[PDB]
CSV table of C-alpha atoms and ligand atoms in Angstrom, one decimal:
chain,number,residue,atom,x,y,z
A,1,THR,CA,0.2,-0.1,-0.1
A,2,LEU,CA,1.1,3.5,-0.5
A,3,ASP,CA,1.1,6.1,2.4
A,4,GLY,CA,0.4,9.2,0.6
A,5,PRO,CA,1.1,12.1,-0.2
A,6,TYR,CA,-2.9,12.6,-0.7
A,7,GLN,CA,-4.3,16.0,-1.6
A,8,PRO,CA,-6.5,17.8,0.8
A,9,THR,CA,-10.0,15.8,1.3
A,10,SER,CA,-12.8,14.8,4.1
A,11,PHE,CA,-13.4,11.5,5.3
A,12,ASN,CA,-14.2,9.6,8.6
A,13,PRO,CA,-10.8,8.3,9.3
A,14,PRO,CA,-10.7,4.5,10.8
A,15,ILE,CA,-9.4,3.5,14.1
A,16,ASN,CA,-5.9,3.0,14.4
A,17,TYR,CA,-4.1,5.3,11.8
A,18,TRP,CA,-2.2,8.2,12.2
A,19,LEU,CA,-2.7,10.8,9.6
A,20,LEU,CA,0.6,13.1,8.9
A,21,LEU,CA,0.0,16.9,7.7
A,22,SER,CA,2.5,18.5,5.8
A,23,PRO,CA,1.2,21.9,5.6
A,24,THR,CA,2.6,24.9,3.5
A,25,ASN,CA,0.9,28.0,5.1
A,26,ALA,CA,0.4,28.9,8.5
A,27,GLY,CA,-3.6,28.8,9.2
A,28,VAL,CA,-6.1,25.9,9.9
A,29,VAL,CA,-4.2,22.7,8.7
A,30,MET,CA,-7.2,20.3,9.5
A,31,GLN,CA,-10.4,19.9,11.5
A,32,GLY,CA,-12.8,17.6,12.6
A,33,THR,CA,-16.1,17.2,13.8
A,34,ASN,CA,-18.5,14.2,15.4
A,35,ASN,CA,-21.1,16.6,14.9
A,36,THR,CA,-22.7,16.0,18.8
A,37,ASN,CA,-20.0,17.1,21.2
A,38,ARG,CA,-16.8,17.6,19.8
A,39,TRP,CA,-15.4,20.4,17.0
A,40,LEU,CA,-11.4,20.5,16.8
A,41,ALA,CA,-9.0,21.9,14.6
A,42,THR,CA,-4.7,21.8,14.6
A,43,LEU,CA,-3.6,25.5,13.6
A,44,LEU,CA,0.0,26.7,12.5
A,45,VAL,CA,1.7,29.4,13.3
A,46,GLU,CA,5.3,30.6,12.4
A,47,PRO,CA,8.4,31.3,13.9
A,48,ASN,CA,8.5,34.4,15.9
A,49,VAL,CA,5.0,36.2,16.2
A,50,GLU,CA,3.8,38.5,19.2
A,51,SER,CA,0.3,37.7,20.8
A,52,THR,CA,-2.1,38.5,18.1
A,53,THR,CA,-5.9,37.7,17.2
A,54,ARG,CA,-5.8,36.4,13.9
A,55,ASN,CA,-9.2,34.9,11.9
A,56,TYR,CA,-9.3,31.1,10.9
A,57,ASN,CA,-12.1,30.0,9.3
A,58,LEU,CA,-13.2,26.9,11.2
A,59,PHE,CA,-16.1,24.6,9.9
A,60,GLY,CA,-16.8,27.6,8.0
A,61,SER,CA,-17.3,30.0,10.8
A,62,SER,CA,-15.0,32.8,10.8
A,63,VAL,CA,-13.2,32.8,14.6
A,64,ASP,CA,-10.7,35.2,16.2
A,65,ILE,CA,-8.3,33.3,18.2
A,66,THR,CA,-5.5,35.2,20.0
A,67,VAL,CA,-2.2,32.9,19.1
A,68,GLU,CA,1.7,33.7,19.6
A,69,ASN,CA,5.2,31.8,19.2
A,70,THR,CA,8.1,32.6,20.9
A,71,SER,CA,10.2,30.6,19.2
A,72,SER,CA,12.4,32.4,17.2
A,73,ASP,CA,13.0,29.8,14.7
A,74,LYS,CA,10.4,26.9,14.7
A,75,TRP,CA,6.6,26.5,13.8
A,76,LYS,CA,4.1,25.9,16.3
A,77,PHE,CA,1.1,23.8,15.9
A,78,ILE,CA,-1.9,24.9,18.1
A,79,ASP,CA,-4.4,22.0,19.1
A,80,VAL,CA,-8.1,23.7,19.7
A,81,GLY,CA,-11.2,22.6,20.4
A,82,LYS,CA,-15.2,23.4,21.4
A,83,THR,CA,-17.6,21.2,23.3
A,84,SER,CA,-20.6,22.5,22.1
A,85,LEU,CA,-22.1,23.8,18.7
A,86,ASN,CA,-21.8,27.3,19.9
A,87,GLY,CA,-19.1,27.1,22.7
A,88,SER,CA,-16.0,28.9,22.7
A,89,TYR,CA,-12.2,27.1,21.3
A,90,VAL,CA,-9.9,26.3,24.0
A,91,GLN,CA,-6.1,25.6,22.7
A,92,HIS,CA,-5.0,22.7,24.0
A,93,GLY,CA,-1.6,20.9,23.2
A,94,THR,CA,0.9,22.6,21.2
A,95,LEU,CA,4.2,21.0,18.8
A,96,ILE,CA,7.2,23.3,18.4
A,97,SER,CA,8.7,21.6,15.1
A,98,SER,CA,11.5,22.3,12.4
A,99,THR,CA,9.8,20.0,10.4
A,100,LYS,CA,6.4,21.4,9.7
A,101,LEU,CA,4.7,18.1,10.4
A,102,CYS,CA,2.0,17.0,12.4
A,103,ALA,CA,-0.5,14.1,13.1
A,104,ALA,CA,-3.8,12.7,14.5
A,105,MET,CA,-4.6,9.1,15.2
A,106,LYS,CA,-7.9,7.9,16.8
A,107,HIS,CA,-7.4,4.6,19.2
A,108,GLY,CA,-8.7,3.2,22.0
A,109,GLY,CA,-11.6,5.9,22.4
A,110,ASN,CA,-8.7,8.6,22.7
A,111,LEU,CA,-7.4,11.1,20.1
A,112,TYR,CA,-3.6,11.4,19.6
A,113,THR,CA,-1.5,14.3,18.6
A,114,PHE,CA,2.3,15.1,18.7
A,115,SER,CA,3.3,17.5,21.7
A,116,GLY,CA,6.7,18.5,22.6
A,117,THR,CA,9.7,20.4,20.9
A,118,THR,CA,11.3,18.5,18.1
A,119,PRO,CA,12.9,16.3,17.4
A,120,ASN,CA,11.5,14.8,21.0
A,121,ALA,CA,7.9,15.0,20.0
A,122,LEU,CA,5.5,12.3,21.3
A,123,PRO,CA,2.3,11.4,20.7
A,124,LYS,CA,-0.2,11.8,24.1
A,125,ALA,CA,-4.1,11.3,24.2
A,126,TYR,CA,-6.8,13.5,24.6
A,127,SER,CA,-9.6,11.3,26.3
A,128,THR,CA,-12.1,13.9,27.6
A,129,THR,CA,-14.6,12.0,25.4
A,130,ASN,CA,-15.0,9.1,23.0
A,131,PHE,CA,-13.8,10.5,20.0
A,132,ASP,CA,-13.9,7.5,17.7
A,133,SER,CA,-16.5,8.9,15.6
A,134,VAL,CA,-14.9,12.5,14.8
A,135,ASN,CA,-14.3,12.9,11.2
A,136,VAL,CA,-11.7,15.3,9.3
A,137,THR,CA,-11.0,17.8,6.4
A,138,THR,CA,-7.7,17.9,5.7
A,139,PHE,CA,-6.2,21.1,4.3
A,140,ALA,CA,-3.2,20.1,3.5
A,141,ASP,CA,-1.5,17.2,1.7
A,142,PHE,CA,-1.2,13.9,4.2
A,143,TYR,CA,-0.1,10.4,4.7
A,144,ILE,CA,-1.8,7.4,6.3
A,145,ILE,CA,0.2,5.4,8.3
A,146,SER,CA,-0.8,2.2,10.5
A,147,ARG,CA,-0.3,2.2,14.0
A,148,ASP,CA,1.6,-1.0,13.4
A,149,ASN,CA,3.8,1.3,11.8
A,150,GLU,CA,3.6,4.2,14.4
A,151,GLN,CA,7.6,4.5,14.8
A,152,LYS,CA,7.7,5.2,10.8
A,153,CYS,CA,5.2,8.1,11.6
A,154,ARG,CA,7.2,9.4,14.9
A,155,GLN,CA,10.6,9.4,13.1
A,156,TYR,CA,9.1,11.8,10.7
A,157,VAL,CA,7.5,14.1,12.9
A,158,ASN,CA,10.4,14.8,14.2
A,159,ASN,CA,13.1,14.4,11.5
A,160,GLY,CA,11.8,15.2,8.4
A,161,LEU,CA,10.1,13.3,5.2
A,162,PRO,CA,12.3,11.4,2.9
A,163,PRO,CA,13.0,13.7,0.0
A,164,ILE,CA,11.4,11.6,-2.5
A,165,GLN,CA,7.9,10.6,-2.8
A,166,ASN,CA,8.7,7.1,-1.8
A,167,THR,CA,7.4,6.6,1.9
A,168,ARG,CA,6.2,3.5,0.6
A,169,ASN,CA,9.7,2.2,0.3
A,170,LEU,CA,11.7,4.1,2.9
A,171,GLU,CA,11.8,3.6,6.6
B,201,LIG,C1,2.2,0.7,24.5
B,201,LIG,C2,2.8,1.4,25.4
B,201,LIG,O1,2.9,1.3,26.6
B,201,LIG,N1,2.2,2.9,25.2
B,201,LIG,C3,1.4,3.2,23.7
B,201,LIG,C4,-0.2,3.3,23.9
B,201,LIG,O2,-0.7,2.3,24.3
B,201,LIG,C5,-1.6,2.5,25.4
B,201,LIG,C6,-2.8,2.9,24.3
B,201,LIG,O3,-3.3,1.6,23.7
B,201,LIG,C7,-3.7,3.0,25.2
B,201,LIG,C8,-5.7,3.2,25.0
B,201,LIG,O4,-6.6,3.8,25.7
B,201,LIG,O5,-3.9,2.0,26.2
B,201,LIG,C9,-2.7,2.0,27.1
B,201,LIG,O6,-3.0,1.0,28.0
B,201,LIG,C10,-3.4,1.8,29.4
B,201,LIG,C11,-4.7,2.6,28.9
B,201,LIG,O7,-4.4,4.0,28.1
B,201,LIG,C12,-5.3,3.2,30.0
B,201,LIG,O8,-6.6,3.7,29.8
B,201,LIG,C13,-5.4,2.2,30.9
B,201,LIG,O9,-5.9,2.7,32.6
B,201,LIG,O10,-4.0,1.9,31.4
B,201,LIG,C14,-3.7,1.1,30.5
B,201,LIG,C15,-1.7,0.9,30.8
B,201,LIG,O11,-1.5,-0.4,30.7
B,201,LIG,C16,-1.7,1.6,26.0
B,201,LIG,O12,-0.7,1.5,26.6
B,201,LIG,O13,-0.3,3.8,22.5
B,201,LIG,C17,-0.1,5.3,22.4
B,201,LIG,C18,-0.6,5.1,20.9
B,201,LIG,O14,-0.1,4.5,20.0
B,201,LIG,C19,1.3,4.7,21.9
B,201,LIG,O15,2.2,6.1,21.4
B,201,LIG,C20,2.5,4.3,22.9
B,201,LIG,O16,3.6,3.8,22.8
B,201,LIG,C21,4.3,3.6,23.7
B,201,LIG,O17,5.0,5.6,23.4
B,201,LIG,C22,5.9,5.5,24.7
B,201,LIG,C23,6.2,7.2,25.1
B,201,LIG,O18,5.2,7.5,25.8
B,201,LIG,C24,7.2,5.0,24.9
B,201,LIG,O19,7.5,5.5,23.5
B,201,LIG,C25,6.8,3.4,24.1
B,201,LIG,O20,7.9,2.7,23.6
B,201,LIG,C26,6.1,3.4,23.0
B,201,LIG,O21,5.5,2.1,23.0
B,201,LIG,C27,5.8,1.8,21.1
B,201,LIG,O22,4.7,1.9,20.6
B,201,LIG,C28,3.7,1.3,21.0
B,201,LIG,C29,2.8,2.3,19.7
B,201,LIG,C30,3.6,-0.1,20.4
B,201,LIG,O23,4.1,-0.2,19.0
B,201,LIG,C31,4.3,-0.8,21.6
B,201,LIG,O24,4.8,-2.0,21.5
B,201,LIG,C32,5.8,0.1,21.3
B,201,LIG,O25,6.7,-0.6,22.4
């Protein structure tokens, strides 16, 4: 099977698969909802950004969110979520990254993302509800990696993708 890249799309990912996103621009990298109690997204902020309110298109709504990135040279992914249709978005985990890659996976009812600072970022779980039915819309090219191959996804998130579109053959 070919892990990617695949172009931006919407689907409801099966459990036990990492989605590895390779965004080009700051903004909304991906979003997802179960239409009941979770509306989630990952934001990307470029290096060297003072506290500033930016507009983000989340599920078609214009949402103002105050962000910052005090890293002088690394990009910052920010996990955000709300827990009701009209609730406020809250910022949770962050990933400080020199590779510009982030990832998410549904497993065991939890939603895993990477957090920390590359090259030592690790998957951490969100477990405030059962996330198995949350879908995704990606706004960047992405790769699909099984949990059985989680070590590949950790390696890419922390150290970068290969220089050729052959991740299928490269570990
Ligand atoms: C395998 C492990 O120890 N941690 C991996 C974790 O596995 C946990 C999930 O299956 C989770 C789902 O609910 O269940 C955990 O069991 C917990 C329950 O979470 C908790 O509710 C209950 O009360 O207590 C039990 C305790 O037994 C599982 O342990 O899944 C993560 C997402 O895949 C994964 O990232 C994590 O992998 C480990 O990560 C740590 C760093 O935090 C180290 O790097 C480990 O080396 C790494 O394990 C390695 O990767 C995992 C995916 C698997 O391939 C391992 O065989 C491998 O050594």
